PDB file of C-alpha atoms in Angstrom:
ATOM      1  CA  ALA A  53      22.413  58.916  29.064  1.00  0.00           C
ATOM      2  CA  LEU A  54      21.453  60.993  26.408  1.00  0.00           C
ATOM      3  CA  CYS A  55      22.423  64.808  26.724  1.00  0.00           C
ATOM      4  CA  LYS A  56      22.685  67.965  25.286  1.00  0.00           C
ATOM      5  CA  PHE A  57      26.109  68.513  24.022  1.00  0.00           C
ATOM      6  CA  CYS A  58      26.531  71.728  22.205  1.00  0.00           C
ATOM      7  CA  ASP A  59      29.491  72.668  24.308  1.00  0.00           C
ATOM      8  CA  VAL A  60      29.572  76.591  24.697  1.00  0.00           C
ATOM      9  CA  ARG A  61      26.766  78.661  23.142  1.00  0.00           C
ATOM     10  CA  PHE A  62      25.538  82.198  23.597  1.00  0.00           C
ATOM     11  CA  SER A  63      22.401  82.211  25.558  1.00  0.00           C
ATOM     12  CA  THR A  64      19.786  84.798  26.274  1.00  0.00           C
ATOM     13  CA  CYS A  65      18.527  82.848  29.540  1.00  0.00           C
ATOM     14  CA  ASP A  66      18.365  85.469  32.224  1.00  0.00           C
ATOM     15  CA  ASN A  67      15.685  86.887  34.657  1.00  0.00           C
ATOM     16  CA  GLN A  68      13.811  83.707  34.690  1.00  0.00           C
ATOM     17  CA  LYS A  69      13.262  80.599  36.957  1.00  0.00           C
ATOM     18  CA  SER A  70      14.018  78.099  34.269  1.00  0.00           C
ATOM     19  CA  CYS A  71      15.633  78.130  30.948  1.00  0.00           C
ATOM     20  CA  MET A  72      15.554  75.547  27.835  1.00  0.00           C
ATOM     21  CA  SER A  73      19.148  75.085  26.453  1.00  0.00           C
ATOM     22  CA  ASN A  74      17.724  75.572  22.893  1.00  0.00           C
ATOM     23  CA  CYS A  75      20.550  73.147  21.969  1.00  0.00           C
ATOM     24  CA  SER A  76      19.806  71.172  19.010  1.00  0.00           C
ATOM     25  CA  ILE A  77      22.350  68.241  19.383  1.00  0.00           C
ATOM     26  CA  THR A  78      21.346  65.402  21.617  1.00  0.00           C
ATOM     27  CA  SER A  79      24.141  62.899  21.873  1.00  0.00           C
ATOM     28  CA  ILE A  80      24.470  59.487  23.726  1.00  0.00           C
ATOM     29  CA  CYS A  81      27.172  59.780  26.156  1.00  0.00           C
ATOM     30  CA  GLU A  82      30.431  57.856  25.182  1.00  0.00           C
ATOM     31  CA  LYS A  83      30.801  56.200  28.584  1.00  0.00           C
ATOM     32  CA  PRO A  84      27.773  54.467  30.878  1.00  0.00           C
ATOM     33  CA  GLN A  85      28.928  56.537  33.762  1.00  0.00           C
ATOM     34  CA  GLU A  86      28.748  59.852  32.000  1.00  0.00           C
ATOM     35  CA  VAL A  87      26.031  62.285  33.105  1.00  0.00           C
ATOM     36  CA  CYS A  88      24.751  65.493  31.627  1.00  0.00           C
ATOM     37  CA  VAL A  89      26.172  68.851  32.493  1.00  0.00           C
ATOM     38  CA  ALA A  90      25.082  72.613  32.109  1.00  0.00           C
ATOM     39  CA  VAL A  91      27.107  75.630  32.979  1.00  0.00           C
ATOM     40  CA  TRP A  92      25.607  79.177  32.711  1.00  0.00           C
ATOM     41  CA  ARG A  93      28.079  82.267  32.586  1.00  0.00           C
ATOM     42  CA  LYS A  94      27.237  85.696  32.846  1.00  0.00           C
ATOM     43  CA  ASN A  95      30.277  88.342  32.279  1.00  0.00           C
ATOM     44  CA  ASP A  96      30.172  91.970  31.576  1.00  0.00           C
ATOM     45  CA  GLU A  97      29.836  91.020  27.812  1.00  0.00           C
ATOM     46  CA  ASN A  98      27.486  88.086  27.398  1.00  0.00           C
ATOM     47  CA  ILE A  99      25.644  85.082  28.613  1.00  0.00           C
ATOM     48  CA  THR A 100      26.728  81.897  27.685  1.00  0.00           C
ATOM     49  CA  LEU A 101      25.372  78.240  28.372  1.00  0.00           C
ATOM     50  CA  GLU A 102      27.479  75.228  28.017  1.00  0.00           C
ATOM     51  CA  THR A 103      26.025  71.884  27.668  1.00  0.00           C
ATOM     52  CA  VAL A 104      28.236  68.512  27.728  1.00  0.00           C
ATOM     53  CA  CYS A 105      28.302  64.948  28.751  1.00  0.00           C
ATOM     54  CA  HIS A 106      30.856  64.471  31.570  1.00  0.00           C
ATOM     55  CA  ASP A 107      32.053  61.631  33.794  1.00  0.00           C
ATOM     56  CA  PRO A 108      31.257  62.700  37.321  1.00  0.00           C
ATOM     57  CA  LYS A 109      34.434  60.948  38.876  1.00  0.00           C
ATOM     58  CA  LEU A 110      36.364  63.489  37.026  1.00  0.00           C
ATOM     59  CA  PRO A 111      36.401  67.105  37.985  1.00  0.00           C
ATOM     60  CA  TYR A 112      34.772  69.779  35.431  1.00  0.00           C
ATOM     61  CA  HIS A 113      35.997  73.427  35.311  1.00  0.00           C
ATOM     62  CA  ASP A 114      37.733  72.210  38.699  1.00  0.00           C
ATOM     63  CA  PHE A 115      34.687  71.161  40.331  1.00  0.00           C
ATOM     64  CA  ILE A 116      33.100  68.025  41.412  1.00  0.00           C
ATOM     65  CA  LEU A 117      29.686  67.433  40.125  1.00  0.00           C
ATOM     66  CA  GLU A 118      28.101  66.677  43.521  1.00  0.00           C
ATOM     67  CA  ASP A 119      24.772  66.565  42.120  1.00  0.00           C
ATOM     68  CA  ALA A 120      25.073  63.897  39.600  1.00  0.00           C
ATOM     69  CA  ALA A 121      22.514  61.530  40.685  1.00  0.00           C
ATOM     70  CA  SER A 122      19.720  63.886  40.354  1.00  0.00           C
ATOM     71  CA  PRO A 123      17.206  63.669  37.688  1.00  0.00           C
ATOM     72  CA  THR A 124      16.899  67.510  37.217  1.00  0.00           C
ATOM     73  CA  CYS A 125      19.457  70.007  36.443  1.00  0.00           C
ATOM     74  CA  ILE A 126      19.411  72.414  39.520  1.00  0.00           C
ATOM     75  CA  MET A 127      21.836  75.506  38.922  1.00  0.00           C
ATOM     76  CA  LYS A 128      24.110  76.118  41.783  1.00  0.00           C
ATOM     77  CA  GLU A 129      26.505  79.122  41.935  1.00  0.00           C
ATOM     78  CA  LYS A 130      30.188  78.398  42.156  1.00  0.00           C
ATOM     79  CA  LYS A 131      32.748  81.051  43.131  1.00  0.00           C
ATOM     80  CA  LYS A 132      34.655  82.460  40.057  1.00  0.00           C
ATOM     81  CA  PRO A 133      36.082  85.870  39.801  1.00  0.00           C
ATOM     82  CA  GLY A 134      35.405  88.159  36.906  1.00  0.00           C
ATOM     83  CA  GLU A 135      31.916  86.321  36.040  1.00  0.00           C
ATOM     84  CA  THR A 136      28.873  84.836  37.682  1.00  0.00           C
ATOM     85  CA  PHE A 137      29.185  81.032  37.366  1.00  0.00           C
ATOM     86  CA  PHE A 138      26.387  78.526  37.699  1.00  0.00           C
ATOM     87  CA  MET A 139      26.603  74.726  37.197  1.00  0.00           C
ATOM     88  CA  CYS A 140      24.373  71.820  37.385  1.00  0.00           C
ATOM     89  CA  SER A 141      24.404  67.938  36.600  1.00  0.00           C
ATOM     90  CA  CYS A 142      21.916  65.241  36.259  1.00  0.00           C
ATOM     91  CA  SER A 143      21.427  61.878  34.999  1.00  0.00           C
ATOM     92  CA  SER A 144      18.172  61.505  33.015  1.00  0.00           C
ATOM     93  CA  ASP A 145      17.665  61.885  29.580  1.00  0.00           C
ATOM     94  CA  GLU A 146      18.219  65.561  28.025  1.00  0.00           C
ATOM     95  CA  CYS A 147      17.979  66.812  31.663  1.00  0.00           C
ATOM     96  CA  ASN A 148      20.589  69.402  30.743  1.00  0.00           C
ATOM     97  CA  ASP A 149      17.996  71.035  28.216  1.00  0.00           C
ATOM     98  CA  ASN A 150      15.987  72.444  31.212  1.00  0.00           C
ATOM     99  CA  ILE A 151      18.068  74.387  33.670  1.00  0.00           C
ATOM    100  CA  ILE A 152      16.310  75.317  36.795  1.00  0.00           C
ATOM    101  CA  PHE A 153      17.608  78.518  38.879  1.00  0.00           C
ATOM    102  CA  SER A 154      14.515  78.457  41.500  1.00  0.00           C
TER     103      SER A 154
END
């Protein structure tokens, strides 16, 4: 897969059904089994969006990417203290460039 791969960046994504990553780095994932991932995080100081390639047989941020076969990145909330944490994964080109909350 080709994925957005900006790692963690500041984001203005908030209060809307979907957001573009605004990441200008598209990479070919190193291994064929890797999928695209996005992580949206809001704490009391800022909002960030993380975009990477990742092998779904390996945990990421201590979670398994259960949705890796999906073609779209549908954000789901994870239990994390101190912040609001949403993650999605997907296996179509640049699919982590469009993160969907609805």
